[PDB]
């Protein structure tokens, strides 16, 4: 009965045999707690959007081969039924690579167990993994297709493949074939590339509808001329019309002026194109989900993206401006719009040192260490995210400062160094490849190595983390390593088994109570770390992401109220990696602050 | 052993043998929805108060004799446990008369079934009923007494008795005897009166600790000296230190400056005096609970009182300044203060007229009317609050306007008049006792009479309501009356029988529905409803009577709507009973509407 298709006559979509144009906003269910899905979707519907667009991050659902996460916050099918229920159509972007400022562009790290794998190509081991994944994901998506009573109207194949070096058309044909096998022959399949013949050359394929992306700085006539070169008939489509842009730690927060977004949007819409706003809400890279660009620069925890809905889902000026623009082409729904959530400043919460990482290896590594003559990568020791401790012992005496070095810039991505429990400093990928250490002969040399996010774009998406090449001490190669994978998540959640200048990396814990019986508490809040330097934060064992007040521009992290409790005290755990304000006699300096406003744009 | 006593040697209270003085705030549980009890008491705790004071309005708990309300919003026992769980002490004021700008000063209207009753006196019928109420309420309060493990440290007997004319000391001794009977010999019993010998004269009694009240305009030294005259030894106590004042419809909203309150509080506390702030939160007079003053002037729906916590419980600047003053004397609790609740503007909701009151008689009055030669009062027809319809026929032709009058000024308190379904205007207690009417001989004369609130202070608390004396037409007494007491609360919850039982316009019901989405964490929120183009009436949402609106007079324009009576997915039904003029006649539906705004307007122009 229900039909969605391209008609090449009036250069648009037909939905059930009538002209249709979509006005869509991106929302990534993996960046919004499920608790807030309906709030974010309804606020989108109230803006006049007739569709949403989302990415399926493969690594978010298949963290090990044959092990799947489809429940609760990982419940993509529920997210799509929710959008359908609210009268929203869906543009589905299942990858397998999605880019998206997300860890390894969505590709699982365990693909790198074949060290020579060519990602995003007809590499047969890559293809076999993708097919297995498609064979799990696509049967789930099939009943959600418009034609089968669901909201899914079009499906993107890959993501900006014309920007990748490999240019493997056999790979794209494999995807087309497999998508067609699981989804049937009616579903509209499409690609998205940069709006210029140089990008379309390797991205476009026969039988996949070619669409472009571009933001407020591109000539709109030209951008659409580049799409029409590939598709002379059918809908003009901008699949990613930038409402804002991404951040990197240590760089200024990106913003795009409302007026530019509204002007461009009106223009796109008036030509009768379908369009998706990237992002409409950005949300947050919780835990270790953020990505990175080459040359190595990680994106921060916040994925606010200067979107119309702020990271916490607030209604912004930009929100109402775009709504006003869409009102010129559609009647938007009636009624008042769900509000920006109330925010509460819980104030200062004092922390106490629980344990250094060194002192906690029993619980961080219950299996015992892996021993190896040379250093092993994260992939080889079977850890994907977080931190691995690399231990050796000095061979020569170092009373005088000896150079500890990764000659091949093989510290991926940052390493916190200690000799016999004296902090020595930091090795930084691309930036600091040498550091002067001291200690006795037979001293324990510790390098705590952080994966700061796998690169999500470009040639270097095969980003093994860890010590990926040798380290040398006074030009001599350090050998005889004792490598500890670290179950930081497990250990924080069990209060490190205790259930019932630099400083050494350590866990700091405190807590705070919220009164019950109060109809408006708990509320959303923002955590601040003044005096801290770099680390990871959990509240009630929930990993809220990374803090780095030392680099900016993000100083506060979003804390959604639903992980806060009133029946029992809430516990905050910080893993500070470089310097904690906690030696002081004054214990009041060893503390975090909850504030009612975000600071993601610090100078 | 748990003890709380007056230390007469040391001019002080002893709590478990230690010196104690209290810094209390008034909160009336009958004026805050239960949903928000814990919110207000925690805000009051976080202010630095170590006690709260509250009244028990008898009529709130015994609407008819031997028929009690002690559950939910009427659950005083629970309110007190909640104050105790928060570590607050409680100063209980159970009347039996409480004043409090509350209908009849808390006295049940049914006491008036004896027309000649002398209230607040040793009149034997008033005593019997008081005694019966104390036998119900006081045994419930006994285990909440500090000595028995609860929060209650002192208990007020009567309320400003010294201001009342009767000066019946036997009455006071009767109360003391019965309070002692149910509560025991250790409870601290006390009285409150104006800070001046002319009030303390009839208020004070041996055995009851004498305390005073006074506000920011009183001389603190003179006030405490009047107290010391009755009580030479023991703690100084201002039982009602006014942080603001009451309103009346038609008068500007009363405010008292934060500075004057702060500096008076400082000085009271510098004396080592115990003090209670009246009000700390004021809340709302829902339904028909408001009182009035003589000469007749009703207090409005809002009981904001310019309190440190606003009507809807907001922290105000006054709150912070008062918290700061207390901090100078006492350590105040640590941690963040629960916030002002989020308010939400639901916007315009259109209503439409469902039925005039005239057309809804059968559902409003299902047992039928009472027939009487001359008019009967609300009490005689067994209705205490709301509206009573009086009906007769014109005994003569009035094709030329003829005067309808209540020569003895006996329309209590407002009558909405119609002849054969044509509205004629309004009769008003004091202001307008005559109204010109037209109609044919034998036409139906209707007077919809509103009880605007029984006087809560003065000699005139025996306020019957209704047509309390005869009407004349062209000077001749009108006879043969058909009187319909109106069951408006029931009729509204059944949607005028629609849902079954599992210039002027005719008084009429207007209804309209609005939805709020489910699965949104922060919806529904508190709101405020406004009535642009409407005149005077009653409003319900989901059958919860939010009180009276009178935007024609002010100063209150909005009414407070607590979030917990609002529902998701299921439509919320607004019912408006407009009494004088509805904006609903033109061919513009969008005029027939109300608006929900996110800020209160109780203090305008
Ligand atoms: C020249 C920049 C091209 C890199 N592409 C980007 S950076 C921001 C966005 C998101 O990553 C999105 O997932 C990409 O499709 C397009 N894009
Ligand atoms: C000037 C006459 C004073 C009448 N008493 C009042 S008006 C405000 C307050 C409350 O009504 C309160 O219930 C009374 O005790 C004292 N009082
Ligand atoms: C866009 O480019 C076209 C040429 O294709 C040109 O005619 C037009 O002026 C340009 N518009 C803007 C906004 O620069
Ligand atoms: C190590 O020490 C040598 C000699 O003291 C010095 O030249 C060098 O700068 C040091 N390492 C670094 C960080 O450059
Ligand atoms: C380290 O050096 C040894 C010996 O030269 C070599 O076998 C090994 O491959 C090197 N490892 C890395 C990661 O460079
Ligand atoms: C937080 O928890 C610790 C230990 O569980 C406890 O000592 C403290 O009272 C709690 N609240 C704080 C830190 O104020
Ligand atoms: C209050 O009255 C006393 C007399 O009892 C007087 O000494 C004092 O000056 C007065 N204070 C004020 C503020 O008027
Ligand atoms: C009633 O009408 C008479 C004229 O018959 C007039 O004198 C009088 O002022 C009117 N009274 C009122 C209350 O309008
Ligand atoms: C009504 O008038 C009659 C006759 O004067 C009188 O007996 C009676 O008391 C009056 N009733 C009222 C309620 O005024
Ligand atoms: C008002 O809502 C009630 C309850 O659902 C219903 O009985 C009535 O018919 C509704 N009217 C409108 C216009 O929605
Ligand atoms: Cl997307
Ligand atoms: Cl009180």
Exposure string over B127-157, b if 16+ CB within 10 A, otherwise e: bebbeebbeebbeebeebbbbeebbbbbbbb
Contact A36, A9 (CB under 8 A): no
Q: Is B354 exposed, middle or buried (0-12, 13-18, 19+ CB in 10 A)?
A: middle
Q: Which among A248, A224, A285, A245 has a CA at the least distance from the CA of A60?
A: A285
Maximum separation of any 2 CA atoms in chain B, in Å: 81
Same domain, B306 and B182: no
How distant is the Cα of B553 from the closest Cα of chain A, in angstroms?
30
User: B220 C-alpha vs ligand 7 centroid, how far in Å?
Assistant: 8
CA pair distance B314, B338, nearest whole angstrom: 10
Residue showing tokens 């029988």: B497
Helix or strand (DSSP H, E) at A33: none
Contact A386, A420 (CB under 8 A): no
Residue B75 — φ and ψ, nearest 5°?
-80, 75
Angle between helical axes of A317-326 and A258-270 (0-180°, round to 10): 20
Same domain, B543 and B406: no
Contact A447, A467 (CB under 8 A): yes
Same domain, A212 and A312: no
User: What is the rounded end-to-end Cα distance, in angstroms, of chain A?
Assistant: 56
CA distances from A93 to A150, A159, A226, A289 (A): 15, 8, 22, 18
Query: Is the N-terminal amide bond of A96 cis, ω within 30° of 0?
Result: yes
Q: Provide the token pair at B114.
A: 């004896």
Q: Provide the token pair at B514.
A: 């609005």
Q: Is A458 exposed, middle or buried (0-12, 13-18, 19+ CB in 10 A)?
A: middle
Q: Using alpha carbons only, how large is chain B's radius of gyration in Å? A: 25
- Residue A350 CA, closest ligand 6 atom number: 13
Exposure string over B555-583, b if 16+ CB within 10 A, otherwise e: bbbbbbbbbebbeeeeebbbbbbbbbbbb
Contact A115, A155 (CB under 8 A): no
Query: Is the N-terminal amide bond of B555 cis, ω within 30° of 0?
Result: yes
Facing residue for B517 by CB, picked from A35, A338, A513? A338
Name the region of B543 (left: φ>0; alpha: ψ -120 to 50; beta: rest). left
Looking at the CA of B26, which ligand is closest? 12
Q: What is the DSSP letter of B375?
A: P
List residues, by chain if needed, whose CB lies under 5 Å from ion ligand 12: B 26, 53
Q: Which among B507, B487, B485 has a CA at the least distance from the CA of B369?
A: B485
SS3 readout for B559-578? EEECHHHCCCCCCEEEEEEE
Q: Which among A467, A446, A451, A484 has a CA at the least distance from the CA of A370?
A: A484
Pocket test for ligand 7, best of B195, B217, B222 (most atoms within 8 A of CB): B222
Q: What is the DSSP string of B106-158?
A: G--GGGGGSTT--SSS--HHHHHHHHHHHHHHHHHHGGGBGGGTSSEEEEE-S
Q: Provide the token pair at A298.
A: 């990680």
Q: Provide the token pair at A136.
A: 């799990």
List CB contacts of A334: < 8 A, sequence separation 6 or more: none
Q: Which of residues 498-527 of A touch B (CB under 8 A)?
A: 512-513, 515, 517-521, 523
Exposure string over A494-506, b if 16+ CB within 10 A, otherwise e: ebbeeeeebbbbb
Boundary of a domain, candidates A460, A487, A514 = A487
Boundary of a domain, candidates B451, B468, B487 = B487
Same domain, A245 and A327: no
Q: Are strands B347-350 and B414-419 parallel, antiparallel or unpaired?
A: unpaired
* Entry field: residues in chain B: 605
Q: Do A341 and B564 touch (CB under 8 A)?
A: no
Q: Which of residues 542-571 of B touch A (CB under 8 A)?
A: 563-564
Q: Provide the token pair at A153.
A: 């109207």
Facing residue for B517 by CB, picked from A42, A342, A518? A42
CA pair distance A569, A577, nearest whole angstrom: 26
Cross-strand partners of A428: A414, A432
Q: Provide the token pair at B552.
A: 């024609």
Residue showing tokens 């005689």: B380
Q: Are strands A89-93 and A51-55 parallel, antiparallel or unpaired?
A: parallel
Evaluated on CA atoms B163, B168, B169, B172, the torsion sign reads negative
Range of the domain at A193: 1-277
* Chain B contact for A42 (CB, 8 A cutoff): yes
Same domain, A309 and A383: no
Same domain, A73 and A165: yes
Name the region of B337 (left: φ>0; alpha: ψ -120 to 50; beta: rest). beta
Same domain, A108 and A12: yes
Looking at the CA of A350, which ligand is closest? 6
Query: Is the N-terminal amide bond of B153 cis, ω within 30° of 0?
Result: no
Q: How many CA atoms lie within 13 A of B215 on its CB side?
A: 13
Contact B211, B190 (CB under 8 A): yes
Contact A434, A405 (CB under 8 A): yes
C-beta neighbour count of B327 within 10 angstroms? 12
Contact B188, B153 (CB under 8 A): yes
Exposure string over B330-339, b if 16+ CB within 10 A, otherwise e: eebeeebbbb
Beta-carbon contacts below 8 Å between A and B: 64
Q: Do A347 and B338 touch (CB under 8 A)?
A: no
Facing residue for A517 by CB, picked from B38, B336, B563? B38
Facing residue for B338 by CB, picked from A38, A515, A562? A515
Looking at the CA of B54, which ligand is closest? 12
Same domain, B37 and B109: yes
User: A223 C-alpha vs ligand 1 centroid, how far in Å?
Assistant: 16
Q: Are strands A370-372 and A466-467 parallel, antiparallel or unpaired?
A: unpaired
Facing residue for A39 by CB, picked from B342, B521, B564? B521
User: In chain B, which residues have their Cβ closer than 8 Å to the Cβ of A520?
Assistant: 39, 338-339, 341-342
User: B374 C-alpha vs ligand 9 centroid, how far in Å?
Assistant: 7
CA pair distance A250, A290, nearest whole angstrom: 15
Q: Are strands B444-450 and B387-393 parallel, antiparallel or unpaired?
A: antiparallel
CA pair distance A487, A464, nearest whole angstrom: 18
Q: Is B101 annotated as a binding residue?
A: yes
Same domain, A205 and A316: no
User: A481 C-alpha vs ligand 5 centroid, how far in Å?
Assistant: 13
CA pair distance A486, B382, nearest whole angstrom: 78
Q: How many CA atoms lie within 13 A of B329 on its CB side?
A: 22
Q: Provide the token pair at B266.
A: 């400082």
Looking at the CA of B219, which ligand is closest? 7
By alpha-carbon position, which residue is closest to atom 12 of ligand 5?
A469
How distant is the Cα of A317 from the closest Cα of chain B, in angstroms?
18
Contact B307, B271 (CB under 8 A): no
- Residue A192 CA, closest ligand 1 atom number: 15
Q: Report how far Cα B387 is from the mean position of its chain's Cα atoms.
A: 17
CB < 8 Å & 24+ apart, contacts of A229-232:
A229/A197, A229/A200, A230/A200, A230/A204
C-beta neighbour count of B14 within 10 angstroms? 14
Q: Do A519 and B339 touch (CB under 8 A)?
A: no
Q: Provide the token pair at B120.
A: 């607040």
Q: How many CA atoms lie within 13 A of B260 on its CB side?
A: 12
Q: Are strands A152-156 and A89-93 parallel, antiparallel or unpaired?
A: parallel
Pocket test for ligand 7, best of B219, B264, B270 (most atoms within 8 A of CB): B219
C-beta of B573 in contact with ligand 10 (< 6 A): yes
Structural domain count of chain B: 3
3-state secondary structure of A550: coil
Query: Å resolution of this model?
Result: 2.2
Q: Which among B566, B569, B558, B573 has a CA at the least distance from the CA of B525?
A: B566
By alpha-carbon position, which residue is closest to atom 11 of ligand 6?
A511
Q: Are strands A51-55 and A23-26 parallel, antiparallel or unpaired?
A: parallel
Q: Do A562 and B521 touch (CB under 8 A)?
A: yes
Q: What is the DSSP string of A327-387?
A: TTTSPPPPSPPPPPPPB---EEEE-EEEEESGGGHHHH-TT-PEEESSPPBTTTTT--SSE
3-state secondary structure of B48: coil
Q: Which among B103, B110, B115, B145 has a CA at the least distance from the CA of B130?
A: B110
Same domain, B515 and B403: no
User: A463 C-alpha vs ligand 11 centroid, how far in Å?
Assistant: 23
Contact A425, A506 (CB under 8 A): no
User: In chain A, which residues have their Cβ closer than 8 Å to the Cβ of B522?
Assistant: 39, 338-339, 341-342
Q: Provide the token pair at B511.
A: 């209804």
**Helix locations, A389-461, DSSP H:** none
* Chain B contact for A588 (CB, 8 A cutoff): no
CA B146, B149, B155: angle at the middle one, nearest 5?
A: 25
Q: Are strands B347-350 and A557-559 parallel, antiparallel or unpaired?
A: unpaired
Residue showing tokens 């029984």: B454
CA pair distance A204, B64, nearest whole angstrom: 83
User: In chain A, which residues have their Cβ closer than 8 Å to the Cβ of B344?
Assistant: 336, 339
C-beta of A407 in contact with ligand 5 (< 6 A): no
CA B515, B517, B518: angle at the middle one, nearest 5?
A: 125
Question: Which residues of B does the annotation mark as catalytic?
Answer: 160, 240
Q: Provide the token pair at B258.
A: 């934060």
By alpha-carbon position, which residue is closest to atom 11 of ligand 7?
B219
CA distances from A187 to A56, A94, A140 (A): 17, 14, 15
Q: Is A368 exposed, middle or buried (0-12, 13-18, 19+ CB in 10 A)?
A: exposed
CB < 8 Å & 24+ apart, contacts of A327-335:
A327/A48, A328/A266, A328/A269, A329/A23, A329/A269, A329/A270, A330/A23, A330/A48, A330/A50, A332/A46, A332/A47, A332/A48, A333/A45, A333/A46, A333/A48, A335/A46, A335/B347, A335/B515
CA pair distance A519, B152, nearest whole angstrom: 27
Boundary of a domain, candidates B277, B310, B325 = B277
User: B214 C-alpha vs ligand 7 centroid, how far in Å?
Assistant: 15
* Chain A contact for B528 (CB, 8 A cutoff): no
Question: Which residues of A does the annotation mark as catalytic?
Answer: 160, 240
Q: Which chain A residue lies closest to B517 (C-alpha atoms)?
A: A338
Evaluated on CA atoms B393, B399, B400, B401, the torsion sign reads positive
User: What is the rounded end-to-end Cα distance, in angstroms, of chain B?
Assistant: 57
C-beta of B221 in contact with ligand 7 (< 6 A): yes
Instruction: Residue A188: give its domain's CATH number.
Output: 3.20.20.80
List CB contacts of B407: < 8 A, sequence separation 6 or more: B433, B469, B470, B472
Name the region of B120 (left: φ>0; alpha: ψ -120 to 50; beta: rest). left
Contact B40, B309 (CB under 8 A): yes
Q: Which among A270, A268, A274 has a CA at the least distance from the CA of A239?
A: A274
CA distances from B231 to B162, B163, B224, B234, B335 (A): 16, 19, 10, 7, 40
CA pair distance A38, B520, nearest whole angstrom: 7
How distant is the Cα of B519 from the closest Cα of chain A, in angstroms?
6
Helix or strand (DSSP H, E) at B233: none
3-state secondary structure of B89: strand
User: A311 C-alpha vs ligand 11 centroid, how far in Å?
Assistant: 16
CA distances from B214 to A62, B53, B188, B193, B270 (A): 72, 16, 21, 9, 16
C-beta neighbour count of B440 within 10 angstroms? 13
**Helix locations, A64-160, DSSP H:** 76-85, 124-141
Pocket test for ligand 1, best of A215, A241, A278, A290 (most atoms within 8 A of CB): A278
CA B591, B595, B599: angle at the middle one, nearest 5?
A: 145
Instruction: Residue A584: give its domain's CATH number.
Output: 2.60.120.260
Helix or strand (DSSP H, E) at A391: strand A387-393
Q: Are strands A472-473 and A292-293 parallel, antiparallel or unpaired?
A: unpaired
Q: What is the DSSP string of A496-507?
A: TTT-------EE
CA pair distance B237, A20, nearest whole angstrom: 76
CA pair distance B262, A67, nearest whole angstrom: 65
CA pair distance B340, B317, nearest whole angstrom: 12
Angle between helical axes of A76-85 and A124-141 (0-180°, round to 10): 40
C-beta of B571 in contact with ligand 10 (< 6 A): yes
CA pair distance B96, A532, nearest whole angstrom: 61
Q: Which among A596, A525, A517 has a CA at the least distance from the CA of A561?
A: A525
CA pair distance A105, B530, nearest whole angstrom: 53
By alpha-carbon position, which residue is closest to atom 1 of ligand 1?
A194
Contact A412, A430 (CB under 8 A): no
Same domain, A220 and A315: no
List CB contacts of A522: < 8 A, sequence separation 6 or more: A344, A514, A561, A562, A564, A565, A566
CA pair distance A241, A267, nearest whole angstrom: 12
Same domain, A17 and A154: yes
């Amino acid at each position: 009965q229900r039909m969605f298709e391209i008609d090449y006559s009036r250069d648009s979509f037909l939905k059930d045999g009538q002209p249709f144009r979509y006005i869509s906003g991106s929302i990534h269910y993996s960046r919004v707690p499920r608790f807030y899905w309906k709030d974010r979707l309804l606020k989108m519907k109230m803006a006049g959007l007739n569709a949403i667009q989302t990415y399926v991050p493969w690594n978010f659902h298949e963290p090990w081969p044959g092990q799947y996460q489809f429940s609760e916050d990982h419940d993509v099918e529920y997210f799509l039924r929710l959008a359908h229920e609210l009268g929203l159509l869906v543009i589905l972007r299942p990858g397998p690579y999605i880019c998206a400022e997300w860890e390894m562009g969505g590709l699982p790290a365990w693909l790198l167990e074949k060290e020579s794998i060519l990602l995003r190509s007809s590499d047969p081991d890559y293809l076999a993994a993708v097919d297995k994944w498609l064979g799990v994901l696509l049967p789930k998506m099939k009943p959600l297709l418009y034609q089968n009573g669901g909201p899914v109207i079009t499906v993107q194949v890959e993501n900006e493949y014309g920007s990748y070096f490999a240019c493997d058309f056999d790979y794209l044909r494999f995807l087309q074939k497999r998508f067609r096998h699981h989804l049937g022959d009616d579903v509209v399949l499409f690609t998205t590339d940069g709006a210029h013949k140089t990008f379309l050359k390797c991205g476009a394929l026969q039988g996949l509808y070619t669409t472009v992306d571009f933001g407020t700085g591109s000539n709109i006539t030209d951008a659409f001329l580049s799409q029409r070169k590939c598709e002379p008939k059918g809908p003009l489509i901008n699949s990613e019309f930038y409402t804002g842009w991404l951040d990197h730690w240590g760089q200024p927060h990106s913003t795009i002026k409302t007026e530019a977004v509204a002007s461009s949007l009106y223009d796109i819409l008036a030509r009768g194109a379908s369009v998706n706003l990237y992002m409409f809400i950005g949300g947050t890279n919780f835990a270790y989900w953020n990505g990175a660009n080459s040359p190595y620069a990680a994106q921060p925890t916040s994925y606010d993206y200067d979107a119309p809905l702020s990271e916490a889902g607030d209604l912004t000026e930009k929100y109402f401006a775009l709504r006003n623009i869409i009102q010129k082409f559609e009647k938007v729904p009636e009624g008042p719009i769900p509000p920006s959530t109330p925010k509460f400043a819980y104030g200062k919460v004092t922390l106490e040192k629980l344990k250094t990482v060194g002192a906690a290896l029993d619980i961080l590594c219950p299996s015992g260490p892996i021993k190896s003559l040379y250093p092993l990568t994260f992939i080889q020791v079977k850890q994907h995210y977080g931190f691995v401790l690399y231990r050796t012992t000095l061979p020569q005496d170092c009373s005088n400062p000896a150079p500890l070095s990764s000659p091949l810039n093989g510290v991926h991505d940052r390493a916190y160094v200690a000799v016999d429990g004296i902090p020595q400093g930091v090795l930084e990928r691309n930036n600091v490849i040498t550091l002067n250490i001291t200690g006795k002969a037979g001293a324990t040399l510790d390098l705590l190595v952080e994966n700061m996010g796998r690169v999500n774009y470009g040639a270097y998406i095969n980003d093994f983390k860890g010590l990926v090449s040798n380290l040398t001490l006074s030009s001599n190669i350090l050998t005889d390593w004792t490598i500890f994978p670290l179950d930081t998540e497990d250990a924080v959640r069990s209060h490190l088994g205790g259930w019932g200048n630099y400083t050494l990396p350590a866990f700091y814990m405190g807590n705070f109570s919220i009164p019950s019986g109060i109809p408006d508490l708990p509320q959303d809040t923002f955590i601040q770390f003044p005096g801290w330097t770099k680390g990871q934060v959990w509240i009630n064992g929930f990993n809220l992401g990374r803090y780095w007040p030392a680099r900016g521009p993000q100083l506060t992290l979003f804390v959604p109220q639903h992980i806060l409790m009133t029946s029992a005290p809430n516990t905050i755990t910080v893993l500070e990696l470089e310097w904690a304000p906690c030696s002081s006699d004054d214990p009041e300096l060893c503390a975090v602050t909850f504030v009612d406003r975000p600071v993601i744009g610090s100078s």
